[PDB]
Design goal:
It is classed as transport protein. Four copies of one chain form a homotetramer. The first copy, chain A, has ten helices and eight strands. By secondary structure, chain A is α+β, with helices and mostly antiparallel strands. Chain A folds into two domains: 66 residues, Helix Hairpins, CATH 1.10.287.630; 135 residues, Jelly Rolls. In chain A, strand 4 and strand 5 form a beta hairpin. The structure holds adenosine-3',5'-cyclic-monophosphate (CMP) (4 copies). One adenosine-3',5'-cyclic-monophosphate binds next to helix 8 and helix 10 of chain C.
Chain lengths: 201, 201, 201, 201
């Protein structure tokens, strides 16, 4: 009940904000649908809760919640459990809506994403669409090359993703160099399919 | 109502603080007028609200709220939308009152400002006033040269501005080098009109 | 009463979170036992409280609370009081449960621990268990070598520990170089007993 | 009333904390006296309040509250107003009680202090006490030399001081080099009186 009240109290402050700034009706509707999909009638203060625990508890929790994701990603399903845990521990759950530009080509990237559920489209400047779904990840190439996004990525459907900041990406990969190279191999091949090559990889 | 109550509860803590420290009447009046102009009877916890959303939503929101500003600035009205978005996303709304010294000459600057509504006066040490208003920006030269403010800037009227920290200024400009040079061209000419020249530009 | 209510209100948000994410029964039971052991029916906002005080008060407080620990550690019981205080001031109280992997071999360490009460087991990859208890500390070697954890450490019983971040470890040791070397001497000998040697030490 | 209630609610959480950790009676009494002297029956959330204002307002406020201090310090009373403002803006009000060791010789310093009201004693390792009061400042030498505290400083009476972090000390002094040298001149002479000399100064 307390968490349900929290959700309602929050959404109310959100509605009032939108009304104050007079956001268009269709946008208010999108926000409504976003809150519905992202929090599903409940609001928690995770930072506060998880912060009251300790390393092991928090690690056991994240591993439990991400079982499916871990099971659908070739990358983690075979890797060192400590690697996965190190990665899982830094993930931020996010939800994007149909048509959202999650990543735009030519810009500098600050994060990468892991797909738990949903379908996205990888779009290059020269057209050419490639779909990605459950178990796949995207947005890693720029983090590896420290260059620019090599393509755009749109949400085709609602997308439940887990993102990893560029800083946390480097921290874990600095500790597990073999996973970095695994990311490189996949990346080199990906760039090759979109007519690109980068010596950095 | 909740946001209106928030505004009232806040102002009350503000009044009590001023009374405790015994700020002069005229200052208490200025504070009253400031809160009135800045929050206009409503208080929101933007950090909390926007933080519950995601990249796209937040970007759509800021773009909506800043339509006019974007439309009155030659700088953004022609630029890459992703540039504008990158810039808009880092702006902090602020309000200054008539007679306020927004920038003082000879000091190190930590931010620049974009004028949404209001008129300011650019004042040099050797006297000479130049007015700036809606659509213009100021405080950029020091950020570019990493030197000192080349002039003072006073609020002539109430001023509704959007500020950009020195750190965010460098981050976006590091990504969009052509906008940096555009800022330079305008700056070189501005310095020239106040009898100054800087090789850094 | 207020602190007791806080504890109850917190645990309730914790239970609701676990229910939302559907954590297994046995895990919910572990969480229950954790909160019981860690907070013992009371919840305080230390950051807020201690933050209202000043250096001396806070230092006197931590010294009082850690009398026993200080008295059971050869390391501090003989050291400069200002050293101990510098160390105590940066400690974070934590509680781990039986079977928890506090430290895993081969990973990068971010902290070290001081044992106030409890018994842990130091386990090497080649098997070989060594017990550590009240008065002892562990997890320091990696901080000194900037290498990898040279062994794993499991909680044998409930463990009431005080941890020290890698950053605070370097700050205090940079100020008290002789304590660093004391840590080194013990470390060199410890590595030697697990068939290891590091020139860095 | 709201601020008065805040003070009472806070102190209550403080009393409960001390009771939980069982701090000695005399210490609980010192804490009582500390809260009485430091907050004088009122608790405000300055960070929140001042944060709602802007540069000018906040600067006018701090300048008002620190009029006396500014008027009793040879250092600021003659300096550039923008320098004083830059300094005042970074000060943290603190209160120390009789007998407190504000600074201990031989340790690394992280801040300096300005005396608004109270008397302290500068004590060297070789004995020798020198009193300092209203208008004077101390704890600056270590910040300038990046060395160690060259003496200890005890509160003789209750002391109402304004402290300046080492980071803010460098920021302002990097902008006003002539004030740094003024600090140096005084420092060189101070060290000379306690039988010390440092080429860094
Ligand atoms: N050929 C490809 N197949 C699938 N995904 C790709 C391909 N090329 C690029 N991508 C993804 O598109 C993303 C765009 O941003 P990044 O360059 O960070 O990382 C890129 C990859 O994650
Ligand atoms: N000739 C000018 N015309 C308009 N604005 C100016 C002129 N010269 C300087 N300025 C502005 O005055 C500001 C003072 O601070 P900055 O040096 O950061 O940046 C300067 C410009 O924004
Ligand atoms: N021989 C030993 N006896 C006791 N403790 C040890 C021994 N060897 C290693 N350790 C501890 O095991 C810890 C594993 O992590 P660290 O390498 O950080 O630090 C190590 C020491 O704290
Ligand atoms: N001769 C002196 N007279 C007054 N104050 C002094 C004298 N010598 C040192 N101090 C102060 O004692 C402080 C001890 O810490 P610091 O070295 O940071 O800075 C020192 C000065 O602020």
């Amino acid at each position: 009940d307390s968490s349900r009240r929290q959700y309602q109290e929050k959404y109310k402050q959100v509605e009032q904000y939108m009304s104050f700034h007079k956001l268009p009706a269709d946008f208010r509707q999108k926000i409504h649908d976003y809150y519905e999909h992202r929090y599903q009638g409940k609001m928690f203060d995770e930072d506060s809760i998880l912060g009251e625990l300790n390393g092991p508890l928090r690690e056991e929790i994240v591993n439990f919640n991400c079982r499916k994701l871990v099971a659908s990603m070739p990358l983690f399903a075979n890797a060192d459990p400590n690697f996965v845990t190190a990665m899982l521990t830094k993930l931020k759950f996010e939800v994007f809506q149909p048509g959202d530009y999650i990543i735009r080509e030519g810009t500098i990237g600050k994060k990468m994403y892991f797909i738990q559920h949903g379908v996205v489209s990888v779009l290059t400047k020269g057209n050419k669409e490639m779909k990605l779904s459950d178990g796949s990840y995207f947005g890693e190439i720029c983090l590896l090359t420290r260059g620019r996004r090599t393509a755009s990525v749109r949400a085709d459907t609602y997308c439940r993703l887990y993102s990893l900041s560029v800083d946390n990406f480097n921290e874990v990969l600095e500790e597990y160099p073999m996973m970095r190279r695994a990311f490189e191999t996949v990346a080199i091949d990906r760039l090759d399919r979109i007519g690109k090559k980068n010596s950095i990889l």
